């Protein structure tokens, strides 16, 4: 997944940990997927997409 934020810096990634970190999420319900992805990235480090 290719993401380009407002500051114009490219960042390519496969895992969902940093993809969701780049996309600044406004909706609270969509932030639930971002919190568990960072929590899974912080605790274990695998299965952030699953």
């Amino acid at each position: 997944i290719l993401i380009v934020t407002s500051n114009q810096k490219t960042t390519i990634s496969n895992d969902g940990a940093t993809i969701l970190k780049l996309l600044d999420v406004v909706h609270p319900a969509a932030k639930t997927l971002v919190d568990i992805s960072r929590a899974q990235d912080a605790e274990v480090g695998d299965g952030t997409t699953s």
């Binding site: 609270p28 932030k31 639930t32 919190d35 568990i36 929590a39």
Partner: peptide, 9 residues
């Protein structure tokens, strides 16, 4: 009490 949880919310 050490709380472990999936989300800060």
């Amino acid at each position: 009490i050490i709380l472990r949880g999936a989300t800060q919310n």
